[PDB]
Amino acid sequence: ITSAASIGKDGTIYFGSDKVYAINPDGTEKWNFYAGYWTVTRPAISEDGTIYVTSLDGHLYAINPDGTEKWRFKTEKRIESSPVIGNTDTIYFGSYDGHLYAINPDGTEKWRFKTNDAITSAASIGKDGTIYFGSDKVYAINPDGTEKWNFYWTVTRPAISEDGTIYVTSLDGHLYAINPDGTEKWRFKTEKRIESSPVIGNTDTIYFGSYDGHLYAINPDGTEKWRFKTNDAITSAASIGKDGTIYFGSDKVYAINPDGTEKWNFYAGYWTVTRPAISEDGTIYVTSLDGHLYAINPDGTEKWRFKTEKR
Numbered sequence: 391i392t393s394a395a396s397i398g399k400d401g402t403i404y405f406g407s408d409k410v411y412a413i414n415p416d417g418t419e420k421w422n423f424y425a426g427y428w429t430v431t432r433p434a435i436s437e438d439g440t441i442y443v444t445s446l447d448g449h450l451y452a453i454n455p456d457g458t459e460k461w462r463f464k465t466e467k468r469i470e471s472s473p474v475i476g477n478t479d480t481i482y483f484g485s486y487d488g489h490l491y492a493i494n495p496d497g498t499e500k501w502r503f504k505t506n507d508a509i510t511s512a513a514s515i516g517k518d519g520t521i522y523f524g525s526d527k528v529y530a531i532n533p534d535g536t537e538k539w540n541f542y543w544t545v546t547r548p549a550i551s552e553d554g555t556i557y558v559t560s561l562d563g564h565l566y567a568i569n570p571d572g573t574e575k576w577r578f579k580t581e582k583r584i585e586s587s588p589v590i591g592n593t594d595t596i597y598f599g600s601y602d603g604h605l606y607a608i609n610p611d612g613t614e615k616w617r618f619k620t621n622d623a624i625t626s627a628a629s630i631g632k633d634g635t636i637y638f639g640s641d642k643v644y645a646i647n648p649d650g651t652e653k654w655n656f657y658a659g660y661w662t663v664t665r666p667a668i669s670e671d672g673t674i675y676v677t678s679l680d681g682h683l684y685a686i687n688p689d690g691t692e693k694w695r696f697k698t699e700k701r
């Protein structure tokens with residue numbers, strides 16, 4: 391209904407709801423773009439500033455930085471993954487019946503890769519352009535569209551460290567560290583349902599939430615670092631600030647120090663809040679289901695709010 395925010399190179403904050411919104415860092419609206427009946431994906435931003443969203447009307451929209459339509463790609467099947475931008479401006483997303491599409495930056499289809507079952511989480515891209523996504527297996531696809539390897543359900547998105555290690559959280563509570571050649575490096579068992587994608591923070595620590603309200607911090611050697619208990623569910627991914635603070639949403643926006651203690655928490659309404667986005671200056675942006683975009687100072691005070699047109 392309302393996407394999380396994505397931050398452009400000039401600090402512009404984009405999010406999707408009834409429209410795609412471009413918000414200047416002072417909280418003033420730069421432009422809004424009508425992408426069909428409704429926007430359904432978190433906007434993805436190319437290195438040249440193109441903004442990509444999927445619409446309820448069945449199209450992938452490419453939007454220029456000035457808020458004008460660049461092109462549309464009609465998706466055959468219902469798209470279940472948000473667009474992901476490859477290393478050379480290729481756009482990847484997945485369909486409900488297991489098709490991974492690669493779209494050239496000019497709106498033409500590059501290739502499609504069929505898997506057995508639905509692709510409901512986003513892909514992640516390695517340094518050499520490899521495309522990793524989960525499903526029944528974890529798949530690694532070469533940029534040319536041929537399969538590299540697969541690794542033995544997951545409803546989350548792979549996180550990739552600087553050395554190429556791939557981290558995946560499975561629904562039954564494993565965190566797998568996978569080597570780039572597709573062999574298991576280690577697994578860590580939580581025995582808890584996990585519906586949140588991992589994120590790699592300070593000194594390659596891996597963080598993820600459990601449904602029952604624990605934020606886990608795992609060292610890159612496969613050993614537990616700490617937990618942090620909320621008394622609400624965690625079903626979304628966390629984000630790391632430049633000073634290592636870990637930000638996630640539950641009943642509130644939490645800010646957690648790298649040592650596992652709470653720094654602050656911010657109340658952003660009665661609705662579910664989305665994954666926090668962090669700008670270079672430390673500002674934290676969160677959206678709520680009812681079309682509010684919050685800008686939060688790193689000390690936890692509200693900078694400004696923005697409200698959508700239809701909400």
Ligand code: NA
Nearest residue numbers: 616617618650
């Ligand atoms: Na703790």
